[PDB]
Design a protein around this ligand. Structure first.
Ligand SMILES: Nc1ncnc2c1ncn2[C@@H]1O[C@H](COP(=O)(O)OP(=O)(O)OP(=O)(O)O)[C@@H](O)[C@H]1O
Ligand SMILES: Nc1ncnc2c1ncn2[C@@H]1O[C@H](COP(=O)(O)OP(=O)(O)OP(=O)(O)O)[C@@H](O)[C@H]1O
Ligand SMILES: Nc1ncnc2c1ncn2[C@@H]1O[C@H](COP(=O)(O)OP(=O)(O)O)[C@@H](O)[C@H]1O
Ligand SMILES: [Mg+2]
Ligand SMILES: [Mg+2]
Ligand SMILES: [Mg+2]
Lengths: 383, 15, 520, 114, 435, 52
């Protein structure tokens, strides 16, 4: 053993010393004779305790903040998600096949950063801000956090201005405001990506007709898609000329699941540059329902307690703290805005599912795309 | 089994 | 404090006391005189319960090795943990105590195979339970062998005749494939399997010794009274001299019901590997999966969907892939598997049902709503397929069977409109009547399988319209009158000639005119 | 075999070693000899940091952790019980279980001393 | 230098390495085993211990059995020397024609190429199947899916695909049989012997297909990586020799099933309906390597098993997103006897844009989809009335859609062995005009 | 949904016969007479075979 009989052992009660003074002069050469089978003990560094399935447990790292970029000695980034009493459960931004038991982890002192600004406009970065399009580093840009807080009640104003999708059914039936969260929910292969692309292309076609402060700067966040689909998207957004205004944050299906988790936050942090500075933004989180599965993977491998459909308890918090960043700021805050189009895929029209219930509770209205109307000639299949 | 009831609901709903 | 790092003892094992007892006890000056229990080929039981023994020691035991307790009851070393061994028990765990000695045997699990198993009724480990003495003309082969690969096999051309009309015409079965019998309870599954074994006895006397099929019946999880009824039936018919009966019953331990189909499949692999043909019937493979689920949940392996383990697909796949038609360089023998799966209210979306549907070739899907409509054997024709197709169908049966499939396909899509008896069409009523005669055609009593030549004659009787005058309520007598009033000289030459020859289709066009019918 | 019965029963997996340590010391009548040596070891872990690194640091190899304690306790007049106790703890890395295998030894020692 | 087996739980072995642990995805050979046992390192457990999955059966592993590290992942023979062979998951020959000639010995694990080496050339592949050439046209260089349940016609569709496009093709092709039946693997091997696609003996070099077989009997460590073995054999032809390959994968569902069978023993707590937490990430890490780069092209045809005709199950639902053209098969049309049982209102492509096939093909395909959706929306009435109250307005639409339903069916050459009807090859202009 | 006025003569015959043999499977028990009043009936095997 109990506690009361265990703190009384710190007071020394030996009162005989035929072992202490013998081994105290024997200990330090006996430990110096295996001086090369050691690793020097880490306090503020971190040694990888055990790595596997994209999750490293890291001994040490005494002063990491929760949510902080750690960096393994193989150059691979990390993110200290859950700090525990003995280890740090870091998620690995990339392949964990380069990380070994015993590798050194160094904290970077920084919660997770993405480059935001005018210089990221027109580029294709991945879910961390690192460009993948192969045209040099990001110039004319500055770091910012992926996890800024949503603007409060008193920092917003009413959504009075329309955002034109360029789609007849969306503009007439379910019209969008300039700071609105509007879910595009439907089955597979019903045209959700098509509605988002039509919104971006129409925003480009109207940027050449509005006086520079009614301009809308798009962000297409491609979470968990193919790389070839995203290459088709860059081809189309360059053959239309939309890539003077659109940014693409693409964490594809081969990228590690913390990057697919963190890509909507990276895209929204890049899109909040236009909201914070008086311009207008537009973001489409394409397959938010794949960010959800990436978050479930990271939470089940970090042994967080699962809920229904094995999503953790904070999966509503996950999408809500991302979607409440889409606001219409008041005129004392510049009057900028950011309007979001999360794309949730249902299965056989089952809208009762858990993540669909979450994002329907968070957003300001659905754009249903039924698979029956999609083959009944009605394209876009706006139910 | 659970797919029988949801399709049967749409059957009776169109009937 | 520098003592707070050692506050809670970080324990890397559970059985630490059995290791510090290995070093503290020989520190007594009295107790170094070889006073230490050994751990290399022996093992102490740590903890018994529910048919699992955690065994300390056995440092040289193999995974899946048959071990033996000193009480006499055997076991199988299944989990090999870092400190202990998880030994499932092949009997009652009540005779196994904490601290008993476990002797390893050096053997992975063995069964007696050979010609000495024919006629005998064994349990899931090969011990005969019929009481006619031990097994004599046998050798001990392994129970978990690798399934034969791509080169070792060849294509399935020759047919295996079941004697059931709805499965020799619609769902034909070749020697070397695996045909699932899936349905609800009390629908015809054990009946179809029994008719297959009895018809193999009927066919084994009219063929030379290279065509004989020696059946193996594996009964997992049934009562001993059901197995006694089946052994009484297989003795009464005479089919016991070709049949092996492996019965791990319901009172038997869960590792015996787990290892019974591998036992029976290893017994049938003797006839497969020696050029002969086998017919293994794993009755209630779902009860094998239930026994494996118990055996793995008590081994603290993490459950999954319906609390089944991860490897329950591998459990049935590595068993069913041992039913092969071997190539000519390996004797050319075969093995036909008939796994029986019980579903709950026709739900084939269950876990084990989807596994063994995706594993096997065909499926004989039986329904309880057609079982009570008088259509017995209760074969749901729309879902029962066989993926060898007509490659291993009897020619002559193949010449009428595709049209039989087509006419039942038309009758099924003209149905759910026959509540409108006023709807006189005469373009649908002919096929609605013809499908009724064909549905009445494929009915059959149980325990009496018809030979294939009488079957194809009696389907040639109905696909041509010879029975179109006969009322739908007495075609089950009309078929018996057709079979008993045509000559017994045609079946002899259709069995030998192997197809409806043009010197036989115009003979038996006319031989079915001088037969009189119960229908006017 | 035949080990003398403990004066009181105790809990599991750390008080089981202390019940085993008492049962193997009462067969040798070194009960106050090995009780005093455990008290020396608690102060020994407070004196050095390189010896409490053999109980907490998860990266020391099992060969290193078992060869230090053997070479440190190859002499010094320590009992054959306690030399076979610390090698049997350092093999499993249970040297951090010393701090409450000595506590359950006192409560076993204050029971037949009454 | 070696490590030793410490824990054997089915197909998952924990190997304890005294210093210098092998990397993750590295390959380890168990010395002393009867058959060649190969373990692939899955994770680091943390006590100088890796946890592996085994590429064969662990029946007979002793704790303390020594294990040597190979210092690399599973390396398979690749090149021209594999053309016309049958390979194991670990690159061993199982065709009993002797050892495999070696251009190189490539490891089976890589990264998807990059974003920069993607070729954006949507160009059509003509098949010879009317519903495929009409409603869901295939891409040369893009991934194709044949979704269906058990028994609806996926393997017969992939066999008609094999003798329609892989029979007459410029570059080579790879058949990766991932976790399917040994029987149909043998039937495909013998049919490709008999039609000359695989040549035995000294004509072996003129064969134009490599078989890799990881069938159902083999433990799920083998079934999980035989797809990566076949993809490596295709990737040598795409990258080094720079040509257009086809990768026929039979039942890519078995790859995710094989990961799910071991994932609970890997210490991963279970996800939804029975699968691993890392389902989508493993499926993406396999699927994203199959791309037409700037070097070559791999036109993959992936059969997908759909458990109990449930497309909402996540193992067929995740792999709808990694494809360019999906050919969904159905039990419902197979109940009508119509073969190939392709659902015309569920089979999609990215090649159904009017900018890639033209307005005549797109408008004929959309007219077919319109008349079939009109018929599916009238079946609820004509199943209770029977086509007497529609008054010759929407009756001709029924009698045209019921003709289009029959005309979407087509006899297959690979189905002549089943049914006595010869096979057809319907040219693209011919089916466009006929529809 | 449609009532008995939709079935054919062969179907509205078996509806009547099946509703009759549904009622004929019922039987007053000797031990249920304490709360139903109707005395119990032991029905012989020949009686029920001939009656059905
Ligand atoms: N309004 C439209 N008119 C004509 N064709 C369309 C329209 N919308 C979509 N399509 C076609 O439908 C196909 C699917 O569209 P899209 O990719 O937008 O759907 P999706 O929701 O992204 O499906 P998935 O998420 O499964 O990829 C595309 O090939 C596209 O050409
Ligand atoms: N073709 C048939 N003709 C007449 N009776 C039949 C026929 N097939 C089955 N029966 C009867 O129906 C009952 C069905 O029992 P069956 O042998 O089907 O059990 P099972 O469904 O295989 O498994 P279980 O014993 O769990 O129900 C038996 O009493 C059998 O006698
Ligand atoms: N073109 C076709 N013609 C006739 N039968 C077919 C055709 N395609 C598929 N089938 C039938 O569908 C069944 C399933 O075939 P297969 O593709 O091997 O199964 P799965 O789809 O489960 O892989 C086979 O029995 C076959 O007879
Ligand atoms: Mg999309
Ligand atoms: Mg039965
Ligand atoms: Mg198949």
């Amino acid at each position: 053993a109990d506690a009361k009989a265990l703190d009384e052992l710190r007071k020394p009660k030996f009162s005989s010393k035929y072992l202490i003074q013998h081994v105290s002069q024997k200990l330090i050469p006996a430990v110096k004779e295996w001086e090369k089978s050691y690793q020097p003990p880490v306090i503020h560094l971190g040694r990888v305790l055990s790595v596997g399935d994209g999750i490293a447990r890291v001994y040490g790292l005494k002063s990491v903040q929760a949510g902080e970029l750690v960096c393994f000695d193989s150059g691979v980034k990390g993110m200290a998600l859950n700090l525990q009493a003995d280890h740090v459960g870091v998620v690995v931004f990339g392949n964990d096949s380069v990380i070994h038991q015993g590798d050194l982890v160094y904290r970077t002192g920084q919660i997770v950063n993405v480059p935001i600004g005018p210089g990221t406009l027109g580029r294709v970065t991945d879910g961390l801000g690192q460009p993948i399009d192969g045209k040099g580093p990001l110039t004319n840009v500055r770091s910012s956090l992926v996890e800024v807080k949503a603007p409060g009640i008193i920092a917003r104003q009413s959504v009075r201005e329309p955002l034109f999708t360029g789609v007849k059914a969306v503009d007439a039936l379910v019209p969008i405001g300039r700071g609105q969260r509007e879910l595009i929910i439907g089955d597979r292969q019903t045209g959700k990506t098509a509605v988002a692309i039509d919104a971006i292309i129409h925003q480009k076609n109207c940027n050449e007709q509005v006086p520079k402060a009614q301009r809308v700067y798009c962000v297409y966040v491609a979470v968990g898609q193919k790389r070839s689909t995203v290459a088709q998207l860059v081809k189309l957004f360059t053959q239309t000329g939309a890539m003077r205004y659109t940014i693409m944050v693409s964490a594809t299906a081969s990228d590690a699941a913390p990057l697919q988790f963190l890509a909507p936050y990276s895209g929204c942090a890049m899109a909040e540059y236009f909201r914070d500075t008086g311009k207008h933004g537009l973001i489409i989180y394409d397959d938010l329902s794949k960010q959800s599965v990436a978050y479930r993977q990271m939470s089940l491998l970090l042994r967080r307690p699962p809920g229904r459909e094995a999503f953790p308890g904070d999966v509503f918090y996950l999408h809500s703290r991302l979607l409440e960043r889409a606001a219409k700021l008041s005129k004392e805050l510049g009057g900028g805005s950011l309007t979001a189009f999360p794309v949730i895929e249902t299965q056989a029209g089952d809208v009762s599912a858990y993540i669909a219930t979450n994002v329907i509770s968070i957003t300001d209205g659905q754009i249903f795309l039924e698979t029956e109307l999609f083959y009944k000639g009605i394209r876009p299949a706006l139910n | 089994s659970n797919q029988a009831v949801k399709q049967r609901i749409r059957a009776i709903k169109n009937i | 404090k520098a003592l707070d790092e050692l506050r809670k003892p970080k324990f890397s094992s559970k059985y630490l006391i059995q290791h510090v007892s290995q070093k503290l006890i020989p520190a007594v000056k009295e107790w170094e005189k070889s006073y230490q229990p050994p751990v290399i080929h022996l093992g102490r039981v740590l903890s018994v319960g529910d048919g699992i023994a955690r065994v300390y020691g056995l440092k040289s035991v193999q995974a899946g090795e048959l071990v033996c307790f000193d009480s006499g009851v055997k076991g199988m070393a299944l989990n090999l943990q870092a400190d202990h061994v998880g030994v499932v028990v092949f009997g009652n765990d009540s005779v196994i105590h904490q601290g008993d000695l476990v002797y390893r045997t050096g053997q992975i699990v063995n069964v007696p195979i050979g010609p000495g198993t024919l006629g005998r009724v064994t349990d899931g480990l090969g011990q005969p339970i019929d009481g006619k003495g031990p097994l004599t003309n046998v050798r001990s082969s392994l129970v978990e062998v690798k399934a034969p690969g791509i080169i070792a096999r060849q294509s399935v051309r020759e047919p295996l005749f079941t004697g059931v009309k709805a499965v020799d015409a619609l769902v034909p079965i070749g020697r070397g494939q695996r045909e699932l019998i899936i349905g609800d309870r009390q629908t015809g599954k054990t009946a179809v399997a029994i008719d297959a074994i009895i018809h193999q006895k009927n066919c084994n006397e009219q063929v030379p010794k290279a065509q004989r099929v020696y059946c193996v019946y594996v009964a997992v999880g049934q009562k001993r009274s059901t197995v006694a009824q089946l052994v009484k039936l297989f003795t009464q018919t005479g089919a016991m001299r070709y049949t092996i009966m492996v019965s791990a019953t319901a009172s038997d331990a869960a590792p015996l019901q787990f290892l019974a189909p591998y036992s029976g499949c290893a017994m049938a692999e003797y006839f497969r590997d020696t050029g002969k043909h086998g017919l293994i019937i794993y009755d209630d493979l779902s009860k094998q999966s239930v026994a494996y689920r118990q055996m793995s949940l008590l081994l603290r392996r993490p459950p999954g969907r319906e609390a089944f383990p991860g490897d329950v697909f591998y459990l049935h796949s590595r068993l069913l892939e041992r039913a092969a038609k071997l190539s000519k360089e390996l004797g050319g023998g075969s093995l036909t598997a008939f796994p029986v799966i019980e579903t709950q209210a026709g739900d084939v979306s269950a876990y084990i049902a989807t596994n063994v549907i995706s594993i096997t070739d065909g499926q004989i899907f039986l329904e309880t709503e057609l079982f009570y409509k008088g259509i017995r054997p209760a074969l749901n024709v729309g879902l029962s397929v066989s993926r060898v197709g007509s490659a291993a169908q009897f020619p002559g049966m193949k010449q009428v069977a595709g049209t039989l499939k087509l006419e039942l396909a038309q009758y099924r899509e003209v149905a759910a409109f026959a509540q409108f008896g006023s709807d006189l069409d005469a373009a649908t009523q002919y096929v609605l009547e013809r499908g009724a005669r064909l549905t009445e055609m494929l009915k059959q009593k149980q325990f009496a399988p018809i030979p294939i030549e009488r079957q194809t004659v009696a389907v040639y009787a109905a696909t041509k319209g010879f029975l179109d005058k006969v009322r739908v309520q007495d075609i089950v007598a009309a078929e018996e009158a057709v079979i008993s009033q045509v000559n017994p000289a045609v079946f002899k030459i259709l069995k030998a000639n192997g197809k409806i020859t043009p010197a036989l289709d115009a003979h038996l066009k006319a031989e079915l005119r001088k037969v009189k019918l119960p229908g006017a | 075999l035949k080990l003398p019965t403990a004066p009181l029963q105790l809990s599991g997996t750390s008080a089981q070693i202390a019940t085993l340590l008492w049962q193997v010391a009462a067969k040798e009548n070194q009960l106050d000899k090995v009780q005093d040596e455990l008290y020396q070891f608690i102060e020994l872990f407070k004196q050095h940091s390189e010896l409490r690194r053999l109980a907490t640091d998860p990266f020391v190899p099992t060969l290193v952790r078992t060869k230090i304690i053997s070479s440190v306790l190859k002499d010094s007049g320590a009992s054959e019980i306690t030399k076979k106790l610390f090698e049997a703890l350092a093999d499993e890395g249970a040297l951090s279980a010393l701090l409450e295998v000595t506590v359950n030894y006192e409560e076993l020692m204050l029971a037949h001393k009454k | 230098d070696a490590g030793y087996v410490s824990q054997v739980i089915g197909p998952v072995v924990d190997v304890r390495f005294d210093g210098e642990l092998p990397s993750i995805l590295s390959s380890l050979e168990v010395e002393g085993h009867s058959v060649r046992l190969v373990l692939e390192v899955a994770q680091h457990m943390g006590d100088n211990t890796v946890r592996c999955i085994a590429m064969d059966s662990t029946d007979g592993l002793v704790r303390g059995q020594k294990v040597v590290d190979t210092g690399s992942p599973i390396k398979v023979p690749v090149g021209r020397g594999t053309l016309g062979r049958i390979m194991n998951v670990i690159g061993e020959p199982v065709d009993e024609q002797g050892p495999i000639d070696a251009a190189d010995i490539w490891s089976i694990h890589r990264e998807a190429p990059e974003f920069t080496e993607q070729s954006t050339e949507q160009e059509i592949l003509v098949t010879g199947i009317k519903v495929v050439d009409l409603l869901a046209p295939y891409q040369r260089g893009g991934k194709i899916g044949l979704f269906g349940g058990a028994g609806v016609g996926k393997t017969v569709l992939i066999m008609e695909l094999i003798n329609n496009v892989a029979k007459a093709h410029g570059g080579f092709s790879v058949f990766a049989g991932v976790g399917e039946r040994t029987r149909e693997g043998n039937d495909l091997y013998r049919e490709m012997i008999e039609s000359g696609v695989i040549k035995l003996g000294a004509e072996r070099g003129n064969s134009k297909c490599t078989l890799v077989y990881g069938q159902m009997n083999e433990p799920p460590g083998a079934r999980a990586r035989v797809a990566l073995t076949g993809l490596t054999v295709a990737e040598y032809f795409r990258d080094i020799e720079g040509q257009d390959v086809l990768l026929f994968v039979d039942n890519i569902f078995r790859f995710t099933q094989a990961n799910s069978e071991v994932s609970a023993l890997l210490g991963r707590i279970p996800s939804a309906v029975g699968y691993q937490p890392t389902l989508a990430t493993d499926l993406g890490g396999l699927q994203e390597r199959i791309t037409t780069t700037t070097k070559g092209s791999i036109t993959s045809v992936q059969a997908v098993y759909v458990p109990a005709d449930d497309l909402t199950d996540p193992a067929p639902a995740t792999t709808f997103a990694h494809l360019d053209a999906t050919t969904v098969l159905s039990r419902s049309i197979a109940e009508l006897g119509i073969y190939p049982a392709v659902d015309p209102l569920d089979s999609t492509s990215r090649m159904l844009n009017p900018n890639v096939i033209g307005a005549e093909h797109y408008n004929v395909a959309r007219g077919v989809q319109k008349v079939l959706q009109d018929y599916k929306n009238l079946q609820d009435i004509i199943a209770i009335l029977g086509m007497d109250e529609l008054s010759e307005e929407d009756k001709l639409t029924v009698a045209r859609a019921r003709k289009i339903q029959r005309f979407l069916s087509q006899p297959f050459q690979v189905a002549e062995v089943f049914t006595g009807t010869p096979g057809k090859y319907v040219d693209l202009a011919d089916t466009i005009s006929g529809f």
